[PDB]
Amino acid sequence: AERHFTLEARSSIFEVDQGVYLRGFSFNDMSPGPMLVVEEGDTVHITLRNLDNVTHGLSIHAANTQTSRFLGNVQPGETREFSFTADFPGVFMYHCAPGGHGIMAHTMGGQFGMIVVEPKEKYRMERELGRGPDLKLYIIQSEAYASGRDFYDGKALYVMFNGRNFRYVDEPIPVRPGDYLRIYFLNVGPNLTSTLHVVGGIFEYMYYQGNPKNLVVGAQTALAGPSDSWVIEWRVPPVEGDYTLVTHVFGTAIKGALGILRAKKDAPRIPEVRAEGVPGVKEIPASAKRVVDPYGLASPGHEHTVRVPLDPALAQPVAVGAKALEPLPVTVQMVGNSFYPKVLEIPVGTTVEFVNEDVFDLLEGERTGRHDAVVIDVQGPEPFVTPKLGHGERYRITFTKPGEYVYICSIHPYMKGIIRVYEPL
Amino acid sequence: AERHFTLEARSSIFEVDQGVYLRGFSFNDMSPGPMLVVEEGDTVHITLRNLDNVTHGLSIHAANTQTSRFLGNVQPGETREFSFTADFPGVFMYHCAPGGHGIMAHTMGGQFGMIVVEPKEKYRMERELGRGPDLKLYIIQSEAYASGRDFYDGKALYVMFNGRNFRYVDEPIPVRPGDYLRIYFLNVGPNLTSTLHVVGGIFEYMYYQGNPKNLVVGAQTALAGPSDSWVIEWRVPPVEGDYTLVTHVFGTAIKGALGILRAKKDAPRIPEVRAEGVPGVKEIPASAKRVVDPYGLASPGHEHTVRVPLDPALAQPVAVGAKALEPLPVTVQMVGNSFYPKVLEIPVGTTVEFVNEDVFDLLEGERTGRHDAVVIDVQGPEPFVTPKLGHGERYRITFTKPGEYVYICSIHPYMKGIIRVYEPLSQ
Amino acid sequence: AERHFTLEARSSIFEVDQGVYLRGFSFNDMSPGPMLVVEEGDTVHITLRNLDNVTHGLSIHAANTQTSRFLGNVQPGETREFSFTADFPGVFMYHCAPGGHGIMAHTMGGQFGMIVVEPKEKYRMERELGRGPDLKLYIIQSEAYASGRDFYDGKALYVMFNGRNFRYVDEPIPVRPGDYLRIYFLNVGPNLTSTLHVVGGIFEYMYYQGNPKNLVVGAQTALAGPSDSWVIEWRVPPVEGDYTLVTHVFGTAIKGALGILRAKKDAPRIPEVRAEGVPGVKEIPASAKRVVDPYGLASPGHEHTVRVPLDPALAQPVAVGAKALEPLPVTVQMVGNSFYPKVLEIPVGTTVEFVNEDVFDLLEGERTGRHDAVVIDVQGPEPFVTPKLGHGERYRITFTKPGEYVYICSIHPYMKGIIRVYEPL
Ligand SMILES: [Ca+2]
Ligand SMILES: [Ca+2]
Ligand SMILES: [Ca+2]
Ligand SMILES: [Cu+2]
Ligand SMILES: [Cu+2]
Ligand SMILES: [Cu+2]
Ligand SMILES: [Cu+2]
Ligand SMILES: [Cu+2]
Ligand SMILES: [Cu+2]
Ligand SMILES: [Cu+2]
Ligand SMILES: [Cu+2]
Ligand SMILES: [Cu+2]
């Protein structure tokens, strides 16, 4: 058949926990984005629309043909149409791909999902039992970051199944003892490895990449690096109670990646568990505990604020050898399309040094990791507009008077920071 | 056969290097715990006893049947009895499972071990040679943490084979050139991946999860994430000398995960190398150079102490636009069933904000990641008790007078921290 | 056949990005080192020479026989000769092996490379097509570190294919639509996992370790931990354009691990891409923007400098209910054959505590992780010499007068740090 899907690139807000909101980028106002399911040999038609005010694009791992000419560098308001044949069965990632630096920077902000290509060849348990699964479960594991600095460092704030911390503890997935389950698992990462496990289960058959040829049997874990996938076949044992789904990378399980398969003889067949996030929200309620934003300003502001005391060399003349010591500059890094620290408070007389730690400094716009810092809200006498900095390039500003400045990158306008200059009354 | 094993949950202290002690939890006073070996098709009876003052439990990956109802949420002094059939051959992890948050928090404190299910189908090198191994080696790789903060961040202090840094450098494993070795390897993690390697060897046959069907041949490395396992068959080449066992993740090999197979023509046949820690101690000697405790107070105390100077906004009135700036609070995180920083020294007038960074705030007791802070050693006029905080909830306290305080969490009484408040003697 | 290769251990400087220089250790002045290619069943003769002023050695994973007796603990000026038979086909790492602690410490400084053992049994796509590859590509992924602290913590500064950030973006690899490519991939790490991917491709056949028996089919990623390898067979789809080679661990792709296969119908047949770095330099030019050195002093110096104010307990007498508080010591760690922080600036009256965080404290020289700290080129009134510290051992020094001290480890003389003591004028 011919199958058609529409993906819409957008800026969004995701509710990842009770009272916890994440700012980022989506397809169709959900993270993970819409789940696409086709059969091996189908023609797949994609319409990609950019509804945002920055450039986006698309990579789709089910296509064994050129994609970036057709689906990259999609400007604000532009549409693309692309078709391909699904020649390889299994479980595939899709994600945003503006091109260059932006492929990595946008993917980590929420722009990812799953496409399943169901094989003509039946999986082994289906063949052996003469019937299809009693239940199919589709799961994405993914990470959320508090800053571009933390993204470079591999320090995830939350890790989750289908876009919400402990989603399937709050709403346990109903199963029955004796059910043939088929699980479709994709770890999008983007940094951390996963080892998927069910407490009370040994997976009978698993298929690396979801291809029926790549058979592994009798496993306690399914090992998956970023963008690795598996199809897993397992019968629920003939005993009632909770069979917990978890990653055995326990420093990530503790951050949200744990759910429950609740086995009861009379359990209802509910709507299909798709690898899709909850719909995004329109605004942040005033009752929020935390707002996470890797690229821009986050709440509460005080947990992202660095207040620097006066350097000992500025408080008075001090020295080591011959002449007086100069004060040390205070660094603000450009890193992972963000400014680190996000909010800096310094005393009059301090020199700030911007430094670009992003590495890919070719191309332009959302395809580049070059950055500048340009004031957009001026409450002081010393507004600033830095040059555009390549990797490892630097720019110094000395602040001599009190004031407060909100600034952005002109190339990537969702990058935002604050400098405040204080003085004794 | 029917096979019976007894596991005893307890609080323990492990000597992980010369003069270096680690506080945590165990089964039977060793980390890794008792190694269990059965045959495929055996009936396995487990007796679990809780000898500690907090709740514990057990998960056992060789069981393909419901376990949490029968072995979870085991109260202090309680016993459970459970049986299952070993239907699947291989190398399996077992670990503590109070339930919920505690599964992750207790496992990282030391409560893990191995159960092996030997297959009825013989492995390929045994079949080909017509005999069993000349020596079996059972190995667990595991991590130790200085704090729950470091646990969240994946920053291990030590990484080790069978519970002690460079154990098999200090005591090399005797083998002979030409020996048929069979290695049973489990990476328990709980955070880091392993690539097992022997210097001077290429592994002939390997079996993912220890299942004979999952064959990989001719490998320089055996890739294993947390709770992944392998069985490996290899012949020692016909040349004497040291063949070093190591993980090729070299930032973890450097932390303790390296040992020696010492090949000599006249080497005695030693008893099998079991995947079990050295038994623990009851007191820490005065000779100790370091005490590590992820949940509580560590030694020396100064290496875990943050001393804050007076906020510039408190030192005098300061301003940006017009009105004076407020001082920033000093943060104490509850994270990985610990307080971070462990010891905080602040000047009078300072406000502390407790914030709960643990995420799972459901259930109760050892099953929850809710926390409070309650003073239990009062050496000042301002002892305190916070509410019980869920994820991302906060509580502020302003300290106006000098003093010191040791506090715990009432939910998890092994969590411990210190606040000291200082003031110039001139006042 | 009988094949002979010469490896020369030395100290080197690599240009890993434009204007960015990395100090470390090499074979033959390139990182990765020379690529060695043999056939299954060949006798391989190695000549190892140590051209440096510290001990080096060699481990070679293609040898299934004792190596360390013959190639370990190679003193300055020494030569070793070693032969073995290549009995196992695939893609193997080699690296420095002085012994003990130094195996890990030297390998992370750049001393690694690839040896390929081509199988007698033909790979599947070569069998099916009746001909060899149109182009062979040999790729190493490796990491670079700013400090031994960062090495312990898994925090790589750069991650790259064949020794230079975005090398194959700056110079894309020409291919033709329809080409049979065979890729020989080795992740040397030494810490991070990789998931190798081509944008617009699904890998047809892959071989774990490069052994023809270990077949995996139809994959979007090839998962590889440190020292894991693959051989990958893939046909370029019949469409012109760029097919991007990348690791899906996107926090490492963003640090330099991304390249381009540029597909054109009229592309010339270039020479095979060898898994070898760019030859090093003898001096760092005036133009340089960054010098990285995990063991020693880096540039600019101020980005590695910690300046401490006077302890509140030294400023004035303070107490917590009883007698006056003592000041807390300021820690310098010995960790990963380096001092952390690299540069420390402290006020007169401050006590410093050196602590050895390296764990392996047996053996001697480059085989041990024992360390001391000793002032060279003395130009301050209070020079120091610490004892040689084992793991977790400590030593205190109280500084009472102003001055500057450059210091080294006597055991590992390339380790270097600075302490400066300041005083009000
Ligand atoms: Ca919740
Ligand atoms: Ca030791
Ligand atoms: Ca560049
Ligand atoms: Cu995008
Ligand atoms: Cu991709
Ligand atoms: Cu920018
Ligand atoms: Cu427990
Ligand atoms: Cu488990
Ligand atoms: Cu608690
Ligand atoms: Cu070396
Ligand atoms: Cu090696
Ligand atoms: Cu040294």
Summarize the structure.
By secondary structure, the first copy, chain A, is mostly beta strands.
Attribute tags:
binds calcium ion, elongated, Cupredoxin (chains A, C), repeat (chains A, C), homotrimer, 6-stranded mixed beta sheet, 7 helices, Immunoglobulin-like, 5-stranded mixed beta sheet, electron transfer activity (chains A, C), 425 residues, binds copper (II) ion, mainly beta
Please render the helix and strand layout as text:
The structure is a homotrimer.
Chain A: E1 2-17, E2 20-27, E3 36-39, E4 43-50, E5 59-60, H1 68-71, E6 79-85, E7 90-95, H2 101-107, E8 112-118, H3 124-129, E9 135-144, H4 148-153, E10 158-161, H5 167-170, E11 173-175, E12 180-189, E13 194-198, E14 203-208, E15 215-219, E16 222-224, E17 229-235, E18 241-247, H6 250-253, E19 258-263, E20 290-292, E21 305-307, H7 312-315, E22 318-319, E23 330-334, E24 339-340, E25 343-347, E26 351-356, E27 374-379, E28 394-398, E29 403-408, E30 416-424
Parallel strand pairs in A: 1-4, 2-20, 3-8, 9-12, 11-19, 21-25, 23-26, 25-30
Antiparallel strand pairs in A: 1-2, 4-6, 5-7, 7-8, 9-10, 12-17, 13-16, 13-18, 14-15, 14-17, 18-19, 23-24, 26-28, 27-29, 29-30
The structure holds calcium ion (3 copies) and copper (II) ion (9 copies).
Description:
Chain A is mainly β and 425 residues long. Chain A has a domain at 290-422: Cupredoxins -  blue copper proteins (Immunoglobulin-like, Sandwich), CATH 2.60.40.420. Chain A contains 7 helices and 30 strands. The first copy, chain A, has a 6-stranded mixed sheet with strand order 10-9-12-17-14-15, with no helix packed on it. The first copy, chain A, has a 5-stranded mixed sheet with strand order 6-4-1-2-20, with no helix packed on it. In chain A, a hairpin with a 2-residue loop joins β1 and β2 (20-27). The longest helix of chain A has 7 residues, at 101-107. Chain A is elongated and about 85 Å long. Chains in contact: A-B, A-C, B-C. Chains B and C meet through β13, β15, β18, α6 and β30 of B and β7, α2, α4 and β22 of C. The structure holds calcium ion (3 copies) and copper (II) ion (9 copies). One copper (II) ion (CU) is lined by residues 59, 61, 93, 95 of chain B.
